[PDB]
Structure formats: C-alpha cells, structure tokens
Enzyme design. Structure first.
Site, mmCIF file in Angstrom:
data_model
loop_
_atom_site.group_PDB
_atom_site.id
_atom_site.type_symbol
_atom_site.label_atom_id
_atom_site.label_comp_id
_atom_site.label_asym_id
_atom_site.label_seq_id
_atom_site.Cartn_x
_atom_site.Cartn_y
_atom_site.Cartn_z
ATOM 1 N N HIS A 71 -7.141 -6.141 -0.241
ATOM 2 C CA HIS A 71 -6.014 -5.243 -0.039
ATOM 3 C C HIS A 71 -5.398 -5.514 1.326
ATOM 4 O O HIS A 71 -6.045 -5.319 2.350
ATOM 5 C CB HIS A 71 -6.526 -3.806 -0.121
ATOM 6 N N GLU A 78 -8.570 -5.249 -4.740
ATOM 7 C CA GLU A 78 -7.943 -4.162 -3.980
ATOM 8 C C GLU A 78 -8.953 -3.136 -3.443
ATOM 9 O O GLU A 78 -8.675 -2.448 -2.464
ATOM 10 C CB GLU A 78 -6.894 -3.443 -4.846
ATOM 11 N N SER A 92 0.859 -1.191 0.000
ATOM 12 C CA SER A 92 0.000 0.000 0.000
ATOM 13 C C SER A 92 0.894 1.240 0.000
ATOM 14 O O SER A 92 1.750 1.369 -0.871
ATOM 15 C CB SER A 92 -0.981 -0.035 1.180
#
Ligand SMILES: *[C@@H]1O[C@H](CO)[C@@H](O[C@@H]2O[C@H](CO)[C@@H](O[C@@H]3O[C@H](CO)[C@@H](O)[C@H](O[C@H]4O[C@H](CO)[C@@H](O)[C@H](O)[C@@H]4O[C@H]4O[C@H](CO)[C@@H](O)[C@H](O)[C@@H]4O)[C@@H]3O)[C@H](O)[C@H]2NC(C)=O)[C@H](O)[C@H]1NC(C)=O
Ligand SMILES: *[C@@H]1O[C@H](CO)[C@@H](O[C@@H]2O[C@H](CO)[C@@H](O[C@@H]3O[C@H](CO)[C@@H](O)[C@H](O[C@H]4O[C@H](CO)[C@@H](O)[C@H](O)[C@@H]4O[C@H]4O[C@H](CO)[C@@H](O)[C@H](O)[C@@H]4O)[C@@H]3O)[C@H](O)[C@H]2NC(C)=O)[C@H](O)[C@H]1NC(C)=O
Ligand SMILES: *[C@@H]1O[C@H](CO[C@@H]2O[C@@H](C)[C@@H](O)[C@@H](O)[C@@H]2O)[C@@H](O)[C@H](O)[C@H]1NC(C)=O
Ligand SMILES: *[C@@H]1O[C@H](CO[C@@H]2O[C@@H](C)[C@@H](O)[C@@H](O)[C@@H]2O)[C@@H](O)[C@H](O)[C@H]1NC(C)=O
Ligand SMILES: CN(C)c1ccc2nc3ccc(N(C)C)cc3[s+]c2c1
Ligand SMILES: CN(C)c1ccc2nc3ccc(N(C)C)cc3[s+]c2c1
Ligand SMILES: *[C@@H]1O[C@H](CO)[C@@H](O)[C@H](O)[C@H]1NC(C)=O
Ligand SMILES: *[C@@H]1O[C@H](CO)[C@@H](O)[C@H](O)[C@H]1NC(C)=O
Lengths: 532, 532
Positions: free
Chosen positions: B437, B324, B197
């Site tokens: 994610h 995601e 991330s």
C-alpha cells in the site's frame, strides 16, 4: 449331502450353483422371522417358528413391497435396482452362499442392501454373492428387511407401529446368523456387516445401537453413514408423516389405534401410491419413512453418541464415490436428462440448490451458492452442472461420512478410508453422471470377473483387489495382506487422515478427503442456520 | 520573468528547480485559504484574502498537525511518510510545478495526498511533482488539507464543527485552481484530480459531492474509493467520537458550544496524543476522524448515490496493489514484525481476523475464516500470514473499489482498471509485505528516473509507461496513445470487466479482478451480519 443343513430352526435344502466354471452351495430364501402380515404390519418382527421337514431353499425369496422405478422402462441402469422377484409383505428371508467343500469355521460377511429405506432387494443380480463366496472363500449372507411405511412408519409411544421395525428385521437376521451360521461353516465370532447407501447407514446404526452391537465383529460402510440427513427423522417428524399418509388415504385420524387400523386394512400398493406425498419439502435425496431417533434403538441423539464414544469400538472400512449426487439430480432436479449433457442454466442451478438443501433459508442458499460457484465463469453450464453434482454428493454422502469417520476414529480400533473414482468402461448411464452412487457394488461383488458382462481386464483386476481387501479386512481387521509387494492401504488417523483412491491406476494415497467443503457442511452452514 | 505570476489573489514569485539535468518553474507554498486558527479551528475554510506585493513561493509550506509515526525511528520506509516540514495549523497551501517555457493552456493534474485522513503532507519527497511536470509537460498541483480532529471533528447540526472541513479544504484548493491555474499555463477545462489511499477516497468523494463536481474534468483513484469502510462514518458515530475525545481531555460535555470551546483551547498535540483512544473497536485499518455522511457534502448515503447514478459522469482511471493489507498488519496485528518472515500461528491468525473485521459477530468471523483458510494445510504460518494480508487488502481496499467500479461504470463515460503488482528491487521493507500500500506512488511520480535512487532500467521504463498513461489519460480520457505499437489497455466494461497488470513484464490483460472474494465482501458477508 453338502446341500442339507440342520439349523436350530429346522433342516434346509439348498442348491449347487455354478460360478466361474466351478460350483458352490447356495441356500436361498431361508426365513428368519414370521411373515409380518395382517395385524402384524408395522409391528416389530417375531422370530420364525421352527419347522419340521425340509425347507426348500433352492430359489430366491419374494422381495418386500416397495416403490418401483419406471422412469426408464427396460433401461438396465434403472431396472437393475428394481425387484426381480414378486413382491410380498411375506419377505423376511436371507440367502447364504457357502463354498464347496463346506468350511468348518470361516469368515462371514453379511450384506445389507440400499435403496433409501423405500426400496431394495436381497435378490438383485448385482448382489449375487457367489463370486465373492467362491473367490475369497467366505460365507456370504444377504439379509432382507421391510422398507417404506411397512418398515419405518413411526407412531412413537405405541407398540403397534413403534418405528424402526425395518432395522429390527436386520437385527433379527443378524441374531439368526449369530445363532445358526456355524452350521453352514461360518464363524459367528468373525462376522462382518457391510452395506451401501441406506445399507451403509444401517451398518453405522448397528454400531451405535446397543441392541445390535454384540451380533457382529466388524463393519463396512459404502456411501452411507448413520448421520446422513436423509437417513433419520425425529419422532415428531415420524409422527407428522405417518398422520399425513393417513390423511392422504382418507383415514380416521382421531387416534393412533384408529389410524393404524386404517393403514392395516389397505392393500400395500395404496400406501406406495402416496408414499412420496408426505415429504414436508420440495427436495431431492429425501425419503419418506426412514429410521426414527426413538430413544430405544438409539439411546440418545446420534451426535451425542458419537461425541461420548457411545458406540461399538472395532475396525471399520468405508468410503465414497466421486459423483454421489448425479443419480438424484437426474430424477428430481430441473435441467437434468439421461440423454443430454445436461448443461444447467442460471435458473436451473438456483432451483437445484433449493431442492438440495430444503431447510436452508435465503441466506443458507447464498452460502451454498458462494461455495460452489466459479465466479470467473459463473454462467458455464458444465460448471453449473458439475457444481450441483458436488453439492448433492457432499451434503448427502461424503461430508456426513467424513464427520462419522473423524468422530469414530477417536475411539475405534482402526479405520481404513477409500475414494472410489473409476468409471466403468461399460456404463449405460451418460458420462456427465460420472462415478455413480451405487456403481462400486458390482466391483465389490466380482461382476467384472464374468466375461460375458464386457468389463476390461484392468477392471477384473480392480474387482479382485477390492474383493480381497473387503474379505481380508472381514477376516483380520486389516485389508492388507501381510507380505504383498503391493503398497499398503494406510490406516486413517485423526492426525494424518489418509485415504486411497480405488481405481485401475497404481495406488495413490491422499489426505483430508474434502476438508474444505466438509468444514462448510459440517461446521459452518449448520451454525449459520442456527443463528437464523 | 517566468517565475512571476499575477493571480486573482496577488502576484507570486516562484523558483527555478533542476530536474533530470534540465529546469522548470516551481511555486511552492501558495495560500488558498485563511489560516484556520484560534476560533476557526474545526470551522469551514475561508478563502484567502488577497495580498499586495509578492508572495515568496520559493519554499515548501508547513505540514498540517498530525500523528507522527515513530515505530521505526530513522527507517526510510517509515519516515518517508512523516512530515518533512514543521507542523502548523497554518497549513492550507498548495504547490505548482510548471514547465519551462511556460505553456499557454495545458493539461492540469492535482494531487491529493493519502494518510488515512489522520496524516499526510503535500511536501513529501515521494510527491515531488517536478519529474511528472517535466516529463509529461503538465502543470502539476499538489494541494493540502486538514487531517485528524482538526479536519474531521464532526458535531453535526453545529456550524463551529460541522465535520468534513478537510474535504472543504480540498474543494477550495480546486476552486483556486479553477480560478487561477490559467495564469500558470494550466487549462481549467482539463483538470484531473488524482490521489492514493484517503486521497483516492477523497477523489471519489468529489465525484459524488454536488458541490465539488464542477471543479474538475476527470479523476484517478489509487488504492482508495469513497465507499471504503475506513473512509467515512455516520453523524451519530462522528458525534460519539467527538465527545469521547472531549472526555479524554477532561472537557465539559454539557453542550456542543462548551465542548468545542474546550477543544479549541487545547494545544494541537494534546488532541493528537489521545486521537486513537476514541476508536470504538479493537481494530486495524481504522482511523479516528474521517468524513461524515452529513446530508450536505453527500446528499444521501454513498450506496444510494451509486445506485441512482447520482454522481459526476466522466472518465476514471483506477486500481490497486497486490498486497494492500501488509502495512497495517505490521503495525497493529500480533505476530507481524519488520525483521522476521512473520509466520503466523493459529492463535495470531484468529486475533488478526477479529482485528480486521471489528463489526463481525462470531459467525461473521467463521465466515471470513472459511473463505481464507487452506484446509488441506491449515497450520502453515506462511499461508496464515498471506491469508491475513489478503483479508485486510480485500476488505479495506480492493473489494470496496471493485464495488465502486462496477457501480460507476454503468453510468460513466469510460473506466480503465489496473492491478499494480511489481515489487521494487530497492524496497526497504521485508519481502513478506509484498507490493505494499503506497508503493506505486513513486512510479507515478517518476522516482525511478532519478539514477542515484537505485531503481533498475526496467523500473525506469515502467515509471515512464505509468506517467505517460496517467498524463495521456488526464489529457484525453484515454491512457493509450492513438498510434503506439504497444498493446492497448482496454476499457473496463460491465460485461467483460477487463483490467491490466502494471509491472515490468509485457502487458497481460485479465478479467474480473477478485470476483469470488469480492462477492463475499460486497454481497454475502453484509447480508450475513444483517440477518444477525
Ligand atoms: C457385450 O457387448 C455386445 C456386443 O458389443 C453387446 O451387444 C448388444 O446387444 C444388443 C441386444 O441386447 C444387440 O442389438 C440387438 O440386435 C437385434 C438383432 O440385430 C435387435 O433385434 C435388437 O433390437 C431390439 O431391442 C431394442 C430395445 O433394446 C429395440 O430398440 C428394437 O426395436 C428391438 O426390440 C424388439 O423387441 C421386441 C421383443 O423381443 C420385438 O418383438 C420387437 O421386434 C422389438 O422391435 C438389438 O438392437 C447388439 O449386438 C448390441 N447393442 C449395443 C447397443 O451394444 C452385449 O449386449 C454386451 N453384453 C451385455 C451383457 O451388455
Ligand atoms: C544506492 O546503493 C548504495 C550502494 O549499494 C547505497 O549505499 C548504502 O548507504 C549506506 C549509508 O546510507 C552505506 O553505509 C554507511 O557506511 C558508513 C561508512 O562506511 C557508515 O558510517 C554508516 O553507518 C552509520 O549509519 C547506521 C544507521 O543507518 C548505523 O548503524 C551506524 O552506526 C552509523 O551511524 C552513525 O551515525 C551517527 C550520525 O552521523 C554517528 O555520529 C555515529 O557514528 C553513528 O554510528 C553506513 O553503514 C553503504 O554504502 C550502503 N548500505 C546499505 C545497507 O545499502 C545507497 O544508500 C543507495 N542509495 C539510496 C538512495 O538508497
Ligand atoms: C425345490 O424347489 C425347486 C424349485 O422350486 C420352484 O419354486 C417353488 C416356490 C415351488 O413353486 C416349486 O414347485 C418350483 O419348482 C424344484 O425344482 C425342486 O424339485 C425342489 N426340490 C425339493 C427336494 O423339494
Ligand atoms: C524568497 O525566499 C528564499 C528562501 O526563503 C527562506 O524561508 C523563508 C520562510 C524566510 O524565512 C526566508 O528568510 C528564508 O531565506 C530566499 O532565499 C530568497 O532570497 C527570497 N526571495 C525574495 C525575492 O524574497
Ligand atoms: C416417484 N418419485 C416421486 C421419486 C422420487 C425420487 C426418486 N429418487 C431416486 C433416486 C435414485 C434411484 N435409483 C434407482 C438409484 C431411484 C429413484 S426413484 C425416485 C422416485
Ligand atoms: C499510534 N497508533 C495507535 C497507530 C495505529 C495505527 C497505525 N497505522 C498505520 C498504518 C500505516 C502507516 N504507514 C506509514 C503506511 C502508519 C501507521 S501508524 C499507526 C499508528
Ligand atoms: C486395537 O486394540 C489393541 C488392543 O485392544 C491395541 O493393542 C491395538 O494397537 C489397537 N489398534 C488400533 C489401531 O487402535
Ligand atoms: C462517452 O460519451 C460520448 C458522448 O457524450 C459517447 O459518444 C461515447 O461513446 C461515450 N463513451 C463511453 C465509453 O461511454
């Protein structure tokens, strides 16, 4: 005598013609208007002055003056659409095929030919109405109308060349049918107009136009609808092109009177030789002189009429072919050839897109390209070729007709939609061209019944299904016969949006014909171009 | 003693920790900078002043001050990302996991945590580097850095709050590693930075930034890249938000000195309570204080640097997860809930699109909608739900990373790309959220090896494959072991664009990860918004 008929215009004498080893009556080359010649070129048509004695209606009439395709000299696929009779400005005639014995009051179908408004003939082999007349026991009429500058030159506000006079030719032929078809056994209460390409667009235009609405009961539109982008132009655009024609012939442009006088002095072929020079864009599937949105024939814009429900409310039957674009790509787009697979490079694809969407700014071209490109495999020539085909067919035919259909169906009394996707076993064109714009017609007119033409048995059967649909719909507003074990062709509703494939396979029903692509063409892209 | 190490900053004493019924050394909570407190809040970090005596590095350090998610109190899926230690502005520490016996000069991997630049901890269970250190015989470092206003408040042109200081924290930790890791058996020549991330975006930012390039050999980016739209802002935008924060706390806004003085007088929680109020749009996957494009850390714009090849040229390994977007839709988008299938209506879909693309004008929203809507079935809640998921993941993670990848690969010395799409058998989140994610991390850190955590055998195997890839790549620039009967993970080339699925199924290789959608996000849409 069965071949002698008294009409309000005078007596006519037709001819007995053979058909599938039987016979019927035929009346060919009947005049429905005065010849629009000399100082009447460009003018509205006048009704035919009645005649005494007998009109010999035993031969086909002249075809109207028009461009002659000579891209493939002697090639049947090309030549089948050209004039088979001599050309003349004297060309406002219609033909009638009547069963034998003569009926008293039966269903009437009236054919309006295509040809992009620049070409067309009532007299082509492929529009021989005897098979249909005989098989479905209908009175089959084919009308004619002026094409090219001769029928659509539009100098709005003037009465010498108002524009749309080709459409007025069509209407006068329908007036004549309304008035006189009863004498041929036709029922004027049950007249169905049908057409293909510009003829389909014409059919939809008579639905919209108040002056035409009262002269027919139902309508069939084949690969054409009035809102197609090639099918009309604004009056300012009609004016620009009219003047540009004049400029190409070194005409005096100081006024409308002087320009028209100049254009009237010319031999027809001088107008035809430069017809294509007046298009404002490097384009395909665009034609020079088409219907103008004049405020007379069309009280307001096509789109507002469709929204308001300002149109004839009745049954319609219509549809399209799998590969409407291929014909135009062959003729106008770089990369395409009659005798190759026509695999298209990166470069020729981009060129073809520009040609397909002539008003599209750079961003508009990216948008089309994004929609029709397989990005996994973006340099495959077959996908590139097939993509352009789809672009052209979707933009010019399918998506305009789907907009018309969704709009019409909210106010109409019944819609039936088809997708014709059978490739003829005897097709002279190459395979990459697919199910070609125009090649459902031969099925609609029964040519697969003629055994020396080399169609399959399955194809004869398909033609019979189609003719019966067309006729049965003309007669009742429904193509289905009430009892048939055969599956019902369902109504197209706003809600479910059902249509059928027309082919030799047992009928399958589908829904939402090309929604995704047509959302792009009808909603997104226009809005994109408006915001830029 | 194996747990005593002399560094250039002083001696440190670590602790023997158990791991898979064996043991290794751990040094937790080593300071790499001065505590950025009082008048040093918002300032660049200073290096830690050396100390005499022994630093007790037997416990994890404090976590940096940050937002605490309390959407699902006591829910492990939510809580696993929150601080597990007490929060403090005194938080610039790093942790080191060293094998036993101590190596002499082995491969080093340095973890940079995610959390959208507003949150994150070096100390989370899921980032416990002992499994990796032990299994792959690497020295594993996890650094820390200031998040939120504390790390990214940006009043450009001032030296009290320049912006990017969080990234300077990261760099100083890398300086310290470069300078001191040799004493822990680490090889400073072979240091690999990896992150997820915002950590992945950070990794890419150290590749771009000249000041950071020299302090590492290779890089791994997981679901993040420096050009992600949420990952940076212009200096004018940094300024607007900084002032807006000040305005939310009734600060004197007459100058930078007066504003900063006010922001420094506040207790940290007063800044956190209003952090989210400064976002200029109703949005998701956007965070308040992120890296500024300041002309210092980044000599020019990210895009021009990528074009010019102005970046470190080395090997990179990177990829993304199947789903995601889902995490952010759950938290911010109407219609989505933790305990429902979250089928999304017409209305909630349109809302979610607006939220996903906050700069998009009306036309931009139509364009996204056209791309992600199945028009055959446009009111299905599952497709609507799954479509939004894809929109968010494609726009915020996949398509930005694919742009980075295609750009980097033209100048780099080797790229390896993955698509992680295995859903854990023990996942606490609902099934609609998919491969979420953040949930590849537990595989990268070996949690499937711990038997009391309830992963499958196939999952243990996958974790071992992944750890070995990651380590072997850190060590050599290639994740493949030279001999393995196992199929080769191929290089990503500009020409062929190959990547692999990471899952329990036998390795399949694919090409062009989401070209079509990413052409839309990277080329078309931006150009659309520019033309309007
Ligand atoms: C149904 O199926 C049948 C059988 O499968 C189809 O039969 C085809 O028809 C063609 C003719 O149409 C026929 O081939 C002809 O054979 C003749 C004698 O063997 C040839 O003389 C003739 O060639 C001429 O035409 C060609 C142009 O199309 C030229 O390439 C060639 O040089 C010849 O042209 C001559 O013409 C002028 C003027 O007359 C003359 O002065 C010169 O000598 C000049 O050279 C044909 O090859 C075959 O039996 C079939 N061929 C094919 C390809 O299918 C039948 O046509 C089908 N029915 C329908 C309606 O399509
Ligand atoms: C690997 O797999 C195993 C086996 O499949 C997993 O086992 C699960 O673990 C839970 C506990 O984590 C366990 O169920 C517990 O049973 C207890 C006794 O029978 C219950 O007392 C307990 O309930 C409490 O927790 C819930 C909140 O999560 C509340 O709903 C409930 O009211 C109880 O809460 C109490 O807590 C306070 C403070 O202590 C107390 O004062 C109050 O009384 C209050 O009521 C659990 O139900 C099951 O064996 C398994 N359950 C599930 C759903 O899987 C094991 O967890 C797995 N390993 C890992 C790491 O995940
Ligand atoms: C009707 O016409 C038939 C064919 O007409 C032919 O074409 C027209 C235009 C004239 O040029 C004509 O001379 C041609 O023969 C004739 O065969 C037929 O005999 C005519 N019958 C009557 C009753 O007039
Ligand atoms: C090192 O520290 C161990 C644990 O430390 C604990 O946390 C720190 C912050 C202090 O509060 C300390 O009092 C806590 O116990 C100790 O258990 C260990 O004995 C210490 N060892 C040495 C050599 O200092
Ligand atoms: C002479 N010029 C400039 C042009 C330009 C475009 C054209 N498009 C066509 C499309 C279909 C068709 N058929 C016979 C189906 C014939 C033609 S002919 C033609 C001639
Ligand atoms: C309090 N406010 C306004 C907000 C707004 C957006 C947010 N987005 C997240 C996205 C992911 C995530 N994870 C734990 C993965 C946590 C959060 S928390 C969160 C809190
Ligand atoms: C057509 O109109 C008639 C009456 O005018 C009505 O009863 C019938 O249901 C209509 N059918 C359709 C399909 O609209
Ligand atoms: C990486 O660089 C070396 C030499 O600097 C070169 O020989 C090698 O082929 C390069 N590999 C790739 C994948 O670019």
């Amino acid at each position: 005598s069965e071949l002698l008929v008294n009409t309000k215009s005078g007596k006519v004498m037709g001819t007995r013609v053979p058909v599938l080893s039987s016979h019927i009556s035929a009346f060919l080359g009947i005049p429905f208007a005065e010849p629009p010649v000399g100082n009447m070129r460009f003018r509205r048509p006048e009704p035919k002055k009645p005649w005494s004695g007998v009109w010999n209606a035993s031969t086909y009439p002249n075809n109207c003056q028009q461009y002659v395709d000579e891209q493939f000299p002697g090639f049947s696929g090309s030549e089948m659409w050209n004039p088979n009779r001599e050309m003349s400005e004297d060309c406002l005639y219609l033909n009638i095929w009547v069963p034998s014995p003569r009926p008293k009051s039966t269903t009437v179908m009236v054919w309006i030919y295509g040809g992009g408004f620049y070409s067309g003939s009532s007299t082509l082999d492929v529009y021989n109405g005897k098979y249909l007349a005989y098989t479905e026991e209908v009175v089959l009429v084919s009308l004619s109308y002026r094409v090219g500058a001769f029928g659509f030159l539009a100098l709005h506000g003037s009465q010498e060349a108002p524009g749309n006079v080709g459409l007025l030719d069509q209407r006068m032929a329908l007036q004549w049918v309304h008035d006189n078809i009863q004498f041929f056994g036709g029922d004027p209460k049950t007249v169905t107009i049908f057409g293909e390409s510009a003829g389909g667009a014409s059919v939809g235009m008579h639905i919209l136009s108040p002056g035409s609405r009262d002269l027919f009961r139902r309508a069939i539109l084949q690969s054409g609808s009035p809102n197609c982008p090639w099918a009309s132009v604004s009056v300012a655009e009609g004016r620009r092109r009219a003047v540009e024609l004049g400029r190409n012939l070194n005409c005096n442009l100081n006024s409308d009177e002087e320009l028209i006088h100049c254009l009237r002095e010319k031999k027809p072929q001088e107008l035809i030789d430069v017809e294509w020079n007046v298009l404002p864009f490097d384009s395909i599937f665009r034609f020079s002189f088409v219907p103008v949105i004049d405020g007379e024939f069309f009280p307001t814009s096509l789109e507002s009429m469709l929204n308001s429900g300002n149109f004839k409310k009745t049954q319609i039957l219509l549809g399209v072919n799998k590969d409407e674009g291929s014909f135009f790509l062959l003729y106008g787009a770089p990369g395409f050839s009659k005798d190759s697979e026509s695999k298209i490079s990166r470069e020729d694809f981009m060129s073809g897109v520009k040609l397909s969407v002539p008003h599209a700014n750079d961003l508009g071209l990216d948008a089309v390209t994004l929609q029709y490109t397989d990005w996994m495999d973006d340099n495959n020539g077959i996908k590139n070729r097939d993509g352009l085909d789809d672009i052209v067919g979707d933009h010019n035919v399918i998506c305009p007709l789907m907009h018309f259909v969704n709009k019409y169906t909210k106010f109409g009394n019944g819609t039936y939609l088809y997708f014709f996707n059978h490739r003829a076993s005897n097709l002279v064109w190459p395979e990459w061209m697919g199910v070609i714009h125009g090649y459902e017609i031969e099925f609609v007119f029964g040519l697969p019944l003629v055994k020396e033409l080399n169609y399959t048995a399955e194809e004869e059967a398909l033609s019979r299904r189609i003719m019966h649909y067309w006729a049965t719909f003309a007669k009742t507003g429904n193509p289905n016969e009430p009892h048939s074990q055969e599956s019902k062709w369902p109504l197209f509703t706003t809600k479910e949006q059902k249509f059928i494939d027309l082919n030799t396979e047992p009928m399958k029903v589908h829904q939402r014909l090309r929604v995704q692509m047509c959302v792009f063409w009808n909603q997104f892209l226009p809005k994109l171009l408006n915001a830029t």
